[PDB]
Amino acid sequence: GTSKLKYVLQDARFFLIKSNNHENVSLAKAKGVWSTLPVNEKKLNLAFRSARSVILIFSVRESGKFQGFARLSSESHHGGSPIHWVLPAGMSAKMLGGVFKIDWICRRELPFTKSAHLTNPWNEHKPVKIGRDGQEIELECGTQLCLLFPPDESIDLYQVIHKM
Numbered sequence: 766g767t768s769k770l771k772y773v774l775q776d777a778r779f780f781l782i783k784s785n786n787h788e789n790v791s792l793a794k795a796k797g798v799w800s801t802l803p804v805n806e807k808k809l810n811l812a813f814r815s816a817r818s819v820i821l822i823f824s825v826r827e828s829g830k831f832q833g834f835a836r837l838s839s840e841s842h843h844g845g846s847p848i849h850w851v852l853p854a855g856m857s858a859k860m861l862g863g864v865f866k867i868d869w870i871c872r873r874e875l876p877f878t879k880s881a882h883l884t885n886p887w888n889e890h891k892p893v894k895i896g897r898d899g900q901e902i903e904l905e906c907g908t909q910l911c912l913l914f915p916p917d918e919s920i921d922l923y924q925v926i927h928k929m
C-alpha cells in the first residue's frame with residue numbers, strides 16, 4: 766500500500782538531484798550515501814534541520830528518467846572512508862567531500878514521460894523533470910511525483926518512520 770509512504774512524505778521537503786553518471790547513483794543505492802557540491806550541501810543541511818523529512822529525487826543526466834528517491838538521515842559529515850565516486854570533468858573529490866546518510870524509499874525508475882503533467886512552482890512552473898542539481902520542488906508537486914513511482918516492495922518504511 767501507500768499509507769506509510771504518504772506519512773513519510775507529510776510536510777516533507779523535496780530536492781532534485783542530478784547525477785552526471787549512473788555509477789554514482791548505483792553507489793548511493795548500495796551504500797546509502799550521497800555527496801553534492803558545496804552550494805547544495807549547505808542548502809540540504811539547512812533543510813535537514815527544518816523539516817520532518819528531506820527527500821532527494823535522483824535523475825541521471827541524459828537518461829530521461831528518475832532513478833528513485835531517498836530520505837536524508839543525517840547532515841553532511843567528513844572523515845569517513847573516501848567514497849569512490851566517479852568524477853566528471855572539472856569535478857574534484859574535495860568538492861564532493863561532505864557525505865550525507867540516506868535511506869532509500871524507492872529504488873525503481875520513473876520515466877520523464879510519466880511526470881509531464883507535474884510542474885514545479887519553484888522553477889517557474891516548468892515540468893518537474895527540468896531543474897538544476899539541488900533545485901527545490903514544492904511540497905504538492907514533490908508529493909505527487911514521489912507517488913508516481915512504481916512501488917518498491919523490497920523496502921519497509923517502518924524503520925524510516927522511527928527515524929523521524
Ligand SMILES: CNc1nc(Cl)nc2c1ncn2-c1ccccc1
Binds near residue numbers: 783785799801850861
Ligand atoms: C556524488 N555526487 C555527484 N556525482 C556526479 Cl557523477 N555528478 C553530480 C554530483 N552532484 C552533483 N552533480 C552534478 C549535476 C549536474 C552537472 C554536473 C555535476
